[PDB]
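A common beginner's mistake is to predict each chain separately and then try to dock the pieces by hand. The better habit, illustrated here, is to supply every component at once so that their relative placement is modeled jointly.
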Amino acid sequence: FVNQHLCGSHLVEALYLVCGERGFFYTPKT
Amino acid sequence: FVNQHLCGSHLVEALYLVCGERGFFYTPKT
Amino acid sequence: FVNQHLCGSHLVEALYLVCGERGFFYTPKT
Amino acid sequence: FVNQHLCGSHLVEALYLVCGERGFFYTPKT
Amino acid sequence: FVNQHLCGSHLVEALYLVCGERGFFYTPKT
Amino acid sequence: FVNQHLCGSHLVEALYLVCGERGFFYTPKT
Amino acid sequence: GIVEQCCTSICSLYQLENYCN
Amino acid sequence: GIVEQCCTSICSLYQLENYCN
Amino acid sequence: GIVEQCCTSICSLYQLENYCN
Amino acid sequence: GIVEQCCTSICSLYQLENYCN
Amino acid sequence: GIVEQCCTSICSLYQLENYCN
Amino acid sequence: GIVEQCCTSICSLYQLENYCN
Ligand SMILES: [Cl-]
Ligand SMILES: [Cl-]
Ligand SMILES: [Zn+2]
Ligand SMILES: [Zn+2]
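With all components supplied together, the output reads:
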């Protein structure tokens, strides 16, 4: 895999694909 | 607003939109 | 709901989720 | 180009691509 | 059609819609 | 990581994520 | 409308230009 | 859970706020 | 307009809702 | 091909690396 | 190349079409 | 955090994986 530059909703997309049926938490600063 | 079917990546995109900075959890096992 | 920062095609996505089966118009400047 | 099925958010993404600055209407009731 | 400003994954989306079942190659610099 | 169904634009988004700078081919006829 | 032309059926990119402003 | 409420069934945007932190 | 506002500044879902048909 | 491996069936993220250049 | 052009400048769908298989 | 790192800098899928449940 390659390193990523991910903002906004692209991060959430990437988490989605990575975690699958496990799901994930999205927790930005502030 | 409205009610639609929101599945997969579309669901986490909607969570991102609605929650934003608050953050969210996507936990499909429940 | 939280305030949004939405460019390009992210705006159209947000309109889509917000308006549902009502639909929407996308009308940028110029 | 081609012909595909374009549904939901994918349809308004395609409208955005094709119309861009002209703007468009997405009116699923018709 | 209108001219496009497309970065990252938006380019790949645009190639997808344009090429259809023909498919495409994505080949960035370096 | 996980295994999911990845179709259409979602598949090329995943290829983009995974391959990135390397580039990729999306060749649905095979 | 659009949904029928492009989702239910299939459409080209040129057809989708029908819905531009 | 969410998948049932929003994908399998339908949900509002307000319901989706149930899954915010 | 809304397209420009949401990008250069911020906008709300309530403001977005004005663009529904 | 890819469509069969990843859409019709399921695939990992490692399998999808098969289609990198 | 196309990837860089479309991002740093602008590109057309016709130019994109050259990258189809 | 991860949200900020991936945007202001770069991140890996392996780092992303830490945010799975
Ligand atoms: Cl879908
Ligand atoms: Cl962006
Ligand atoms: Zn984007
Ligand atoms: Zn989709």
